[PDB]
């Protein structure tokens, strides 16, 4: 009965680990900012956001070419493909662009923060910063958290806009559907406040979880060159489970 005893010891440490990461979040956001805190947030928007711009724009095109090619092969048997422009822009705006653009943000810019704060912990830069008197949560961690909550909802819109434009390329200009019935099928069925705004609120709840996890794993490492790399797979797995987990809860509320 050791394996049952080891399994129960595993999920007790993982429960306690949530409680440390909850108390770490209440110390960051319940504080008025220190002098100079906006100059570092603009710089941290460059590392997290702008470097992630190339992967999202390219991969957003490749889903749009697939959604236009799969939606045409199904809607041609029933002979109604004036709804092609609807189902492409309805699959992206409420479902795929909130979800897939959080599965690529957890990889590229999610795990990179855990390496960045993690390598500062093994090389004692975090411990050296505290003896000077500077608190490393306000100095290092907090400009990285606020640059994650802002930079992902700005990236699902670029994912959704490039995905529709890419779906317009293979649907209208390669397979040969009508251009005017493509766009006029959108404005009838796709509202703004029910679909585009509910695709943004779905990504703010996703941007909080892919950043608060990816910061806590790099702050509570164990300082070891092979203990860092084991916490970079702990933050890609835990982000992809909370994205798909809060997907169903937010879909049932918004579209139920």
């Amino acid at each position: 009965m050791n394996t049952i005893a080891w399994l129960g010891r595993l999920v007790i440490e993982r429960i306690r680990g949530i409680g440390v990461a909850a108390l770490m979040l209440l110390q960051i956001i319940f504080s008025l900012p220190s002098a100079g805190g906006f100059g570092r947030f603009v710089y941290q928007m460059h590392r997290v956001g702008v470097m992630s711009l190339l992967i999202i724009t390219v991969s957003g095109l490749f889903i749009g070419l697939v959604l236009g090619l799969q939606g045409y092969s199904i809607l041609v048997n029933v002979g109604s493909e004036s709804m092609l422009g609807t189902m492409v822009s309805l699959t992206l705006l409420r479902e795929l662009a909130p979800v897939v653009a959080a599965l690529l943000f957890a990889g590229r810019a999610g795990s990179a923060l855990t390496a960045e704060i993690g390598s500062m912990k093994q090389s004692e830069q975090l411990a050296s910063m505290e003896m000077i008197g500077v608190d490393p949560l306000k100095q290092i961690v907090s400009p990285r958290l606020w640059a994650g909550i802002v930079s992902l909802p700005m990236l699902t819109v670029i994912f959704a806009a490039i995905g529709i434009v890419g779906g317009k390329l293979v649907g209208v200009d390669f397979l040969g559907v009508d251009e005017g019935s493509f766009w006029s099928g959108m404005q009838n069925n796709v509202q703004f406040g029910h679909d585009v705004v509910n695709g943004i609120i779905k990504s703010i709840v996703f941007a909080l979880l892919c950043t608060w996890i990816a910061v806590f794993q790099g702050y509570a490492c164990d300082p070891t060159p092979e203990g860092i790399a084991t916490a970079m797979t702990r933050t890609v797995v835990y982000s992809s489970l909370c994205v798909l987990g809060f997907d169903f809860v937010l879909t049932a509320v918004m579209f139920g």
């Binding site: 429960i15 409680g19 440390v20 909850a22 049932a252």
Partner: protein, 191 residues
């Protein structure tokens, strides 16, 4: 302190279950999120394609859901059992003022004047013991039926409000029903 951490961790997950069972009720996907519901039932001869959670409509407005469909072996008549919302089909305390001068206005008509007794205090006594307690909007010459909602949509119970004399009590069974008209019969007549 470690204990503190633990606690502040059991409180997140317990709050994480309090949200999942809030957002599952307000979605409609579990429980009954319609107020003060009262239940009526009817007896059909043929109800095809009718699951629970169907629509019950008065004129095309969703007022209720169906809960159970059973079948009596002996008499061969099916059984529906639906629940209706009562916020908008009942006469509440305000809405008694609209019906008391209307449902008792049909009682003191020219038809009932020289018929039972022109001294009777029963004709006003019948209404307020039925107007104040256990009232519906549904009349006693209405029949219910099954319709289609777009010749392609799923089935849904439909009430036909026809005429009006008197109401039902909360829990009564509608007598008059109308069965469906399935697909394989319509193609017999059409040809």
């Amino acid at each position: 302190s470690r204990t503190s951490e633990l606690a502040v961790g059991i409180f997140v997950i317990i709050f994480g279950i309090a949200l999942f069972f809030l957002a599952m009720k307000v979605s409609g996907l579990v429980g009954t999120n319609l107020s003060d519901g009262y239940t009526m039932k009817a007896q059909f001869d043929n109800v095809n394609g009718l699951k629970p959670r169907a629509k019950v409509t008065m004129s095309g407005v969703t007022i209720g859901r169906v809960d159970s469909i059973t079948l009596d072996p002996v008499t061969r008549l099916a059984t529906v059992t639906f629940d209706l919302d009562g916020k908008l089909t009942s006469f509440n305390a305000e809405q008694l003022k609209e019906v008391q001068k209307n449902a008792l206005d049909e009682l003191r008509y020219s038809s009932d004047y020289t018929q039972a007794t022109p001294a009777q205090q029963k004709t006003m006594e019948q209404q307020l013991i039925s107007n104040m307690n256990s009232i519906t909007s549904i009349d006693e010459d209405a029949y219910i039926m099954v319709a289609t909602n777009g010749l392609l949509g799923e089935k849904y119970l439909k009430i036909v409000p026809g005429g009006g004399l008197n109401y039902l009590k909360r829990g009564d069974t509608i007598s008059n029903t109308q069965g469906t008209m399935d697909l394989e019969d319509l193609i017999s007549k059409f040809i």
